[PDB]
């Protein structure tokens, strides 16, 4: 998985998977558009990256 603040990252660029966060806490469609409690990434498609 990407580093916290390395070259590859999620909270800086976007989720590495479509509608799936890095921690797997938010994975359904209801949480689409909200950030998690530690990484704080807007869960969405990979195109954002």
């Amino acid at each position: 998985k990407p580093e916290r603040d390395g070259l590859f990252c999620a909270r800086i660029f976007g989720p590495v998977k479509d509608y799936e966060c890095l921690c797997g806490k938010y994975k359904r469609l209801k949480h689409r558009g909200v950030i998690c409690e530690k990484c704080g990434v807007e869960v969405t498609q990979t195109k954002v990256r």
Binding site: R4, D5, K38, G40
Partner: protein, 417 residues
């Protein structure tokens, strides 16, 4: 402000406090998150925080400060410490680091410790002027610690029994061998209350492994000192985590020339937890254990030793037998020869509601002359000799009877004569 001053307060009190501080009602988050948000708000107010935490190092390099009420576990109230302090003072695991802390910004998770103020209730120079644990000379138990309460109560029985069977000293390694349903937990409570009420000069620290949550609550608010527990709501990983926490804390406190008593119950449960956490090595011995899966428990039971130069480390640990399985029996085999203090609780007398059910036959003390004086040993030996006429059941009768008529040791000795 500080951690324990908020953690020894209940959850409703913390919710009311956070709502009084003008915050989003914190009755929705856990108590640890409540205190975390309260500290974040207090730091937002324009000031620093003064925190305290016991120290943990992983293979990364920085330090984690776990709190007391968290049972030394992972949580948001654990303080971050940059590895620079570890490179400076070589702070190993087991410091109640007390110092100034600041709130974490974005990209961070925990509070960062700015400067050191208190190193195990000592000056930070003790962090650079002290002796390690592996280098000193372990000795036998010199000091004698009385167990009897002194009120003539019905549970005083247990204490005085032990006092006339095998006393307890600083630096001892006590192992209790008892089948299920023998009165273990109330024995722990009785002996802890007696050692803490009769001798407040010595420090107590009780360990609970795989008990019920009601047992945790009954243990935590009843005995003095820190009450660390690790129940089933955490896996064997967090079991070994809290175990290594408390052992390194005791080691460092002993290095600080302090008397540390560790109650532990039971050893078979932590041995199973360790077997769970250590991978296999291709071979399985009797009972289903590994080769190195015994090295952790061995070390854990043998860390006890008497420090003649200052401080001491005594442990009182119970074991599980008559469980039907094999691994518990081999564990008892391995740990019955490594301890310098062995005691046994019977089950046949226990199920007859005749308590306490001490095995006066298999009870023993390693090098008891350093724990018992001239005529003291005279009295103890002649009573052992007169109880020696082969007896378990009516031997317990004689003991409990002559113990219920009398109040102190000298009363029994001078009335039996």
């Amino acid at each position: 402000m500080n951690l324990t001053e908020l953690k020894n307060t209940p959850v409703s009190e913390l919710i009311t406090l956070g709502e009084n501080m003008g915050l989003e009602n914190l009755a929705r988050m856990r108590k640890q998150d409540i205190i975390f948000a309260i500290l974040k708000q207090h730091a937002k107010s324009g000031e620093d925080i003064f925190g305290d935490g016991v120290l943990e190092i992983l293979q990364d390099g920085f330090g984690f400060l776990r709190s007391a009420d968290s049972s030394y576990l992972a949580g948001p109230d654990d303080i971050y410490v940059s590895p620079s302090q570890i490179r400076r003072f070589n702070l190993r695991t087991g410091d109640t680091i007390s110092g100034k802390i600041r709130p974490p910004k974005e990209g961070e998770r925990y509070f960062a410790l700015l400067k050191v103020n208190e190193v195990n209730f000592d000056k930070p120079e003790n962090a650079r002027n002290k002796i390690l644990f592996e280098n000193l000379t372990p000795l036998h138990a010199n000091s004698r610690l009385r167990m009897e309460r002194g009120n003539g109560s019905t549970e005083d029985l247990t204490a005085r029994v032990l006092d006339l069977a095998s006393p307890i000293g600083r630096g001892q390694r006590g192992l209790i061998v008892a089948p299920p349903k023998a009165g273990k937990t109330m024995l722990l409570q009785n002996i802890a209350q007696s050692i803490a009420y009769n001798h407040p000069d010595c420090v107590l620290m009780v360990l609970l492994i795989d008990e019920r949550p009601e047992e945790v609550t009954e243990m935590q608010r009843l005995v003095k000192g820190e009450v660390v527990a690790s129940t089933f709501d955490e896996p064997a990983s967090r079991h070994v985590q809290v175990a290594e926490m408390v052992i390194e804390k005791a080691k460092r406190l002993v290095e600080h020339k302090k008397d540390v008593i560790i109650l532990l119950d039971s050893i078979t449960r932590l041995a199973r937890a360790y077997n769970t956490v250590v991978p296999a090595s291709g071979k399985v011995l009797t009972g289903g254990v590994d080769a190195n899966a015994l090295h952790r428990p061995k070390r854990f039971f043998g860390a006890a030793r008497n420090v003649e130069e200052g401080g001491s480390l005594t442990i009182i640990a119970t074991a599980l037998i008559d469980t039907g399985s094999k691994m518990d029996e081999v564990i008892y085999e391995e740990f019955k020869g490594t301890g310098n203090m062995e005691l046994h609780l019977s089950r046949k007398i226990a199920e007859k509601r005749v308590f306490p059910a001490i095995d006066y036959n298999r009870s023993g003390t390693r090098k008891e002359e350093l724990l018992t004086t001239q005529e003291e040993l005279q009295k103890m030996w002649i009573l052992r000799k007169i109880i020696h006429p082969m007896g378990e059941i009516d031997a317990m009768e004689f003991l409990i009877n002559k113990l219920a008529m009398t109040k102190t040791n000298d009363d029994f000795f001078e009335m039996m004569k």
